């Protein structure tokens, strides 16, 4: 279906694949960006411990601070996904 | 110039006005969303201590975790600004 293009990552290759998997599941289940974001966030809080934050959209710029090895920014189809741990 | 509409806030009224002021300055200085976001973030890290994160755009949904009293989501013109402290 949708093409995963990883743009910037500070994250193990294993967890990068988990991120792409999660977002694919999220996009399968939800249509609204905040719901997609919430699905991805909660699953990472569950799997990799708090505290994650997720942004999903077609138009945004960001500037965030993340713990090393806990950052990924990627496209899955025409939507961009920012996912990182801070706190 | 641009209209500040606050959508969701968990933040003192004082700091809410600071946020709107900062974003207005950012939009005066920068055109690119990531640069606008960076300006706002760094100024809040400076003024209110780390760690802030800022998202600026016309199309995004988000799900984040913030420290109480340190969250604002608002429109300034046709751009939306998410600004919150976590970490």
């Amino acid at each position: 279906d949708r093409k995963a293009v990883i743009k910037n990552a500070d994250m193990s290759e294993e967890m990068q694949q988990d991120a792409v998997d999660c977002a694919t599941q999220a996009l399968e289940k939800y249509n609204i960006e905040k719901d997609i974001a919430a699905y991805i966030k909660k699953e990472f809080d569950k799997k990799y411990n708090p505290t994650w934050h997720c942004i999903v959209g077609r138009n945004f710029g960001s500037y965030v601070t993340h713990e090393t090895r806990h950052f990924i920014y990627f496209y899955l189809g025409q939507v961009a996904i920012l996912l990182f741990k801070s706190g | 110039d641009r209209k500040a509409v606050i959508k969701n806030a968990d933040m003192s009224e004082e700091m809410q006005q600071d946020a709107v002021d900062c974003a207005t300055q950012a939009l005066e200085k920068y055109n690119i969303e990531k640069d606008i976001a960076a300006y706002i973030k760094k100024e809040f890290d400076k003024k209110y201590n780390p760690t802030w994160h800022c998202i600026v755009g016309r199309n995004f949904g988000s799900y984040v975790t913030h420290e109480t009293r340190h969250f604002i989501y608002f429109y300034l013109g046709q751009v939306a600004i998410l600004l919150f402290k976590s970490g």
Binding site: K7, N8, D10, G57, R58, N59, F60, G61, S62, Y63, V64, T65, H66, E67, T68, F71, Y73, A80, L82, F84, S86 | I32, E33, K34, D35, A37, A38, T51, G57, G87
Partner: peptide, 10 residues
């Protein structure tokens, strides 16, 4: 332990 990142949609 932490880094700052900028992202921009194209």
């Amino acid at each position: 332990a932490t880094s700052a990142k900028a992202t921009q949609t194209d």
